[PDB]
Nucleic acid binder design. Structure first.
Length: 51
DNA sequence: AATCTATCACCGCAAGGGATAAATATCTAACACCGTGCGTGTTGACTATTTTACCTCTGGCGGTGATAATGGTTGCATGTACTAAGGAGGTTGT
């Protein structure tokens, strides 16, 4: 599961093709997800975003 | 190894800061003069440069004293821990 398996739900370049995520094994297998992405320029903890 | 779109940004290209070099004006230094005085020259009399001679220093070193003096000094090698060797000699054994 790879960059060649993405779809662009927004404005996103991808200078990370080699970032393989996971795998599948059968001729009828599947997996799907959404992903949220951000740029900003500073840091906050995942469970101290607070408001 | 070529293609570019789409990053994070350098260029795209306006502004303005310091710089340095021109001209001026000041500084000092380099010099040319002058004057001083010293180390320019020969000569001469001095006195003590050196030599040798003489008369008489310093220090070379050889020589050995006598009322008599006639049993001496010397202090700590080391105190432990080992144990291998030689030394002893009587004897109960080879």
């Amino acid at each position: 599961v790879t960059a060649a398996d993405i779809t662009h739900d927004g404005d996103v370049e991808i200078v990370k093709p080699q970032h393989v995520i996971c795998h599948l094994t059968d001729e009828n297998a599947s997996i799907s997800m959404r992903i949220k992405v951000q740029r900003g320029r500073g840091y906050v903890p995942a469970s101290t975003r607070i408001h």
